Design a protein around this nucleic acid. Structure first.
Ligand code: CA
Ligand code: CA
Ligand code: CA
Ligand code: CA
Ligand code: CA
Ligand code: CA
Ligand code: CA
Ligand code: CA
Ligand code: CA
Ligand code: CA
Ligand code: CA
Ligand code: CA
Ligand code: CA
Ligand code: CA
Ligand code: CA
Ligand code: CA
Ligand code: CA
Ligand code: CA
Ligand code: CA
Ligand code: CA
Ligand code: CA
Ligand code: CA
Ligand code: CA
Ligand code: CA
Ligand code: CL
Ligand code: CL
Ligand code: K
Ligand code: K
Ligand code: K
Ligand code: K
Lengths: 87, 57, 100, 96, 98, 84, 55
DNA sequence: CCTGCTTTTTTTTTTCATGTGCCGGTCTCACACGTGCCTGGAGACTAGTAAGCGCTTCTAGTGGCGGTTAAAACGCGGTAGACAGCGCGTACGTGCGTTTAAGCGGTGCTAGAGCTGTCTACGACCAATTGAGCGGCCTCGGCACCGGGATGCGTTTTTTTTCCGCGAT
DNA sequence: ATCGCGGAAAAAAAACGCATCCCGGTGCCGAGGCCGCTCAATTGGTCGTAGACAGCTCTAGCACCGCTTAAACGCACGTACGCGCTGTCTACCGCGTTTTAACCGCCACTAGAAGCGCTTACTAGTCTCCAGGCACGTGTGAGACCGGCACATGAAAAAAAAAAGCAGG
């Protein structure tokens, strides 16, 4: 039965252009080359923090599947309340 | 307020952008929902003055 | 004479106008989904996700980063620059209380 | 007269005497300690309340307290707190 | 006569007030300010003295912390002198201000 | 009925300096003292408004420390030491 | 921690400063209490380097 | 450009004096602890229902495929922004002499916080009754996506006006 | 100030190129709404208690005094920093070519979300009972304060030594 699973270095698929677009929408005109790796660091910390709490909600409900609600409850805990996915 | 933003963009139906434009252009609703993220809302057009073309002048 | 070439700043400004008018997610979906799975492995092995949970996560991430880039832009402008640097990000997160 | 206001002071003193038998505490400091215990009490109780509501349970159990602690305390503190809580419950169930 | 250079007493003050815990605004002027402000919301209001001390503790702690952030914004701009634009950037990034 | 008004100037230049000093500030623009007074005023306006709202809800004519504690908590400036 | 801070100052009684020193010098407690004002605590001594003179 | 030089800038260092931790009397008030005694936790009971359990249904999550094409990756060229100097003007730090009013300990007055007992309006609970709002299902117009054409505007080179800018008056 | 005349700099039109805006045409799926049925809100009623009220006690909040002196105020001076202007140099933007893998639409296989019915182990509840924790109140030792103390550090000074500039050659 033992399934697929991958632990690639997926962080690099948060590419330079994608980060440039995020900055654009944030009104940034010019970007130091040191920004891209710095942004990946930040993003990773953000996701670690949200995912940890979402999975804590998952474990508590004795589920194997993370739900939108787990994410939403996690984001509310982190003071980053999200509209549109339930709750 | 959203209905009016929909009417601007020449749309019959309110979508998340219209809510976001509504809320963030209203002093008070923006304060009420200051810590709230509207999925599929974007942000308001805002380019800081210093960043606009001054250039050779 | 030459092919046309816009001045540095101009296409940047055009891209700001483009992305501030739209609401579509700006990070590619599959690479983000993999990144979410990968990070989740550190907390609990063998997880499933509802696809909307991954969308929720991506929506929350991009809003946060776009939020942080606005504050970061101000910090750069505060230092008489037009170029965002890591120290701008660090100043904004420090002031937000995300770091000590 | 009689105009009773409960507080955690005697328990803060009891603990103080285990940890530093010859040291005391000023009333303002005791005030702060009182504020502290009511604050965290409320943070834990509230997150627990929520956990059980989200999961359509009527009952806050030790398991809601535990999960709440993992959510609210930073890493190392959460480990020791979960340890002390688990220890306490084990020791208690073994005394009827 | 003896004379310190600009900044040396300033640092000396910093070391002193960072060592101490006492309130730094005078109490009677602060109390009048509190009363004055409260007037606008409801007349003939009394205050427990502890309520006035609570507010004064909270104002000062807020201001001290706002000045910490203000100082970093000044330094970020290669200055040592805090200015209104520093307080305004701080409050904006904090989300107190639009 | 009390004699009153414009006590914001009783927040003195020296007192503002002392606060900045505790915040590690070494040099201070002249414009800071009046900017700070504005900020201070807004901070108390917000807190007191809320403290007074709790007072009217309780049908009291006296603002308590608890009213302020609760107001401070609502504004995310939780204060320890005053009956929390 | 606060009792230890009291003893460094050769004091028998914990005062709010000792609780403050205790909390702010411990990375995790400081996080747990990041949005909490301790009355009569003051702040940690801390001066930014650029503000010091070249020694 | 070339000694010289000469004249300041930095320096180097001591020491000279400033304000800050340290110390040993002595005073007072708040911590600490003993004393009554009210309330609220505990022991032992009953009754009811939250939730764990086992089990079955079927949602939606996962994985695999191949082809299209949009998007990422990469290098080349060079504009313009970051950054290091430096030099200039005065905003702020310092200190001292004058002036203000906070702080303190106290007394006196009384508003209003806070408590008690009583009565009753109002909310919980229950059982029967039924219509609001749900899930499920069909339809057709709003909207996404396309190509074409219109127009707004950025960029460069050749053209008209402007603001100097030099002395010589 | 005034010519005069260029001298530079600056703004002009103009001509060209490229992106964005907006139209109707086409097409399709998701909003809108209709339907049938279930279960959650309503009706009518009974029952127990929360809280509003009248009345009381006495806490602590307000007002005032008249001392003492710390603190705030204003004024003068001059250092050092904010800030503007120049020059440099390569990091970053724009763009064209090449490469990669996201996206799409669909499928097939099944883990596990989720729902139901069954049974009991837990919890709410209540009475009886008593001891743990509360308010009061009294005492003495910790901590604040004071004068003198001594031990840091920064500024002031001479002694000296290394760079700004003229100066003359
Ligand atoms: Ca299950
Ligand atoms: Ca010690
Ligand atoms: Ca610790
Ligand atoms: Ca010497
Ligand atoms: Ca002694
Ligand atoms: Ca004692
Ligand atoms: Ca005693
Ligand atoms: Ca059930
Ligand atoms: Ca079954
Ligand atoms: Ca290539
Ligand atoms: Ca330049
Ligand atoms: Ca429907
Ligand atoms: Ca469509
Ligand atoms: Ca088109
Ligand atoms: Ca057409
Ligand atoms: Ca329709
Ligand atoms: Ca500068
Ligand atoms: Ca200037
Ligand atoms: Ca450079
Ligand atoms: Ca495709
Ligand atoms: Ca199966
Ligand atoms: Ca006893
Ligand atoms: Ca006592
Ligand atoms: Ca004393
Ligand atoms: Cl940086
Ligand atoms: Cl300013
Ligand atoms: K499923
Ligand atoms: K009272
Ligand atoms: K009633
Ligand atoms: K059970």
């Amino acid at each position: 039965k033992r399934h697929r699973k991958v632990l690639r270095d997926n962080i690099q698929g948060i590419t330079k252009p994608a980060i440039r677009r995020l900055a654009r929408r944030g009104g940034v005109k010019r970007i130091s080359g040191l920004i891209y790796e710095e942004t990946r660091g930040v993003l990773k910390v953000f996701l670690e923090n949200v995912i940890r709490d979402a999975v804590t909600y998952t474990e508590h409900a004795k589920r194997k599947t993370v739900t939108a609600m787990d994410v939403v409850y996690a984001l509310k805990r982190q003071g980053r309340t999200l509209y549109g996915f339930g709750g | 307020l959203a209905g009016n933003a929909a009417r601007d963009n020449k749309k019959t139906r309110i979508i998340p952008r219209h809510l976001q434009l509504a809320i963030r252009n209203d002093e008070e609703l923006n304060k009420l929902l200051g810590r709230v993220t509207i999925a599929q809302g974007g942000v308001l057009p805002n380019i800081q003055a210093v960043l606009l073309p001054k250039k050779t002048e | 004479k030459k092919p046309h070439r816009y001045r540095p700043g101009t296409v940047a400004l055009r891209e700001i106008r483009r992305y501030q008018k739209s609401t579509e997610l700006l990070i590619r979906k599959l690479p983000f989904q993999r990144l979410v799975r990968e990070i989740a492995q550190d907390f609990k092995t063998d997880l499933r996700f509802q696809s909307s949970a991954v969308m929720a996560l991506q929506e929350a991430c991009e809003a946060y980063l776009v939020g942080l880039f606005e504050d970061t832009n101000l910090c750069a402008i505060h230092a008489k620059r037009v170029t965002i640097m890591p120290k701008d990000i660090q100043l904004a997160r420090r002031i937000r209380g995300e770091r000590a | 007269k009689r105009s009773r206001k409960e507080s955690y002071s005697i328990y803060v003193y009891k603990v103080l005497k285990q940890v530093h038998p010859d040291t005391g505490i000023s009333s303002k400091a005791m005030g702060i300690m009182n504020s502290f215990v009511n604050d965290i009490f409320e943070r834990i109780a509230g997150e627990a309340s929520r956990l059980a509501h989200y999961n359509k349970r009527s009952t806050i159990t030790s398991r809601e307290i535990q999960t709440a602690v993992r959510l609210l305390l930073p890493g190392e503190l959460a480990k020791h707190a979960v340890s002390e809580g688990t220890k306490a419950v084990t020791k208690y169930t073994s005394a009827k």
